[PDB]
Amino acid sequence: VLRSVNSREPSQVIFCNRSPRVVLPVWLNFDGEPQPYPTLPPGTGRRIHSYRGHLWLFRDAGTHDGLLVNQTELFVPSLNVDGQPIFANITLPVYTLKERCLQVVRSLVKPENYRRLDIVRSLYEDLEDHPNVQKDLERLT
Amino acid sequence: MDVFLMIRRHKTTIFTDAKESSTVFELKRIVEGILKRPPDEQRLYKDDQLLDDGKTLGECGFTSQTARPQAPATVGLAFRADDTFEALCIEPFSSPPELPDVM
Amino acid sequence: MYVKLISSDGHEFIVKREHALTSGTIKAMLSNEVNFREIPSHVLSKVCMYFTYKVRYTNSSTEIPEFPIAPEIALELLMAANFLDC
Ligand SMILES: CC(=O)N[C@@H](C)C(=O)N1C[C@H](O)C[C@H]1C(=S)NCc1ccc(-c2scnc2C)cc1
């Protein structure tokens, strides 16, 4: 359902990582499968060649937390005008305090050890439910 | 250029904001509205260092990149006990527990 | 317009009304003072910073910085977040 259109009409883009995270760009291919691409260190940028009507999204390369691109989840390259690339400005979202706390707990405690933490079972399940590109795609449907 | 502050006296903490170009006197007027004490019965500090009424917040080292929403800077506050000013006292927050073995 | 948020250990945090309504649990408790019997000051001060952070950077075109959490407060802060629904 969610997938790139095979246009064969080129589009130059600037992937600009304006976040503290190492970023993993993910292209949704012609069957809607997520293909991962080379990472971008925090504060860096790359000029890259894509095509019109291609679907892209962006994640933390280590933990897979979701990130925004021009204030939204999906980015679609469009027609260039006056030799000017399109900017894909990648940023952190305003995470909920709860979700942000979960990220920090995950980074310190191994999945084996989540059950040993002194918390309600509601939070065990929340911890275990890792961020995932496949899950996010099924929501959009 | 906004700045974000914790104005602190005893066990009171006021979360508020201002500009780098704001004066210290404007911080006292904010305190007056909340705690009902006039500017001349207040005394504001950056650590030990007293802040005069005419000084802007930028001059005294409160900048938009240091005094942030998620990590606001502290301004000390001391009231005048009718005759004379009390010593600056700010109660510390509670202590977090020891990290478990699994962290 | 301000509201007083009070920790278990007696600290009185004064924050703007609109910032405190970020938490739905607080929205319910009010609709001027609120007392939290289970949240100590080193946790509750962080909650108050999160409110400020959310109101500044929500629907913002600028770069957004990380909201930091020291490892020593994470477990306690998580449980406050879950209770407060923020
Ligand atoms: C006929 C067609 O459209 N083929 C696809 C496979 C294609 O050429 N694509 C899919 C995406 O629209 C991008 C484009 C490719 S594979 N461009 C080359 C490219 C290589 C590396 C990058 C990246 S991503 C982060 N760093 C780099 C260097 C970006 C684009």
Numbering used by the authors:
A (entry chain C): 62 to 202
B (entry chain A): 1 to 103
C (entry chain B): 17 to 47, 58 to 112
Give the exact sentences the study uses for this entry.
Herein we report the synthesis of VHL ligands bearing thioamide substitutions at the central hydroxyproline moiety, and characterize their binding by fluorescence polarization, isothermal titration calorimetry, X-ray crystallography and molecular modeling. The new structures revealed that the noncovalent interaction network between the compounds and VHL residues was fully conserved and consistent with those observed with previous inhibitors.
To introduce the O-to-S substitution at the right-hand side, the Hyp hydroxyl group of intermediate 5 was first protected with TBSCl, followed by thioamide conversion to give intermediate 6 (68%). Boc deprotection of 8 followed by acylation yielded the final thioamide 2 (69%). In contrast, ligand 2 (single right-hand side thioamide) showed a greater loss in binding affinity (10-fold loss by FP, and 20-fold loss by ITC). An increase in hydrogen bond distances was observed for compounds 2 and 4 (3.0 ± 0.1 and 2.95 ± 0.05 Å for O–H⋯SC groups, respectively) compared to 1 and 3 (2.52 ± 0.05 Å for O–H⋯OC groups, on both compounds). We therefore evaluated the interaction energy of each protein amino acid in the complexes with its surrounding to determine differences in relative EMM-GBSA compared to reference inhibitor 1. The results, shown in Table 1, indicate that the loss in binding affinity observed in compounds 2 and 4 is largely contributed by destabilization of Tyr98 and, to a much lesser extent, of Tyr112, especially in compound 4.
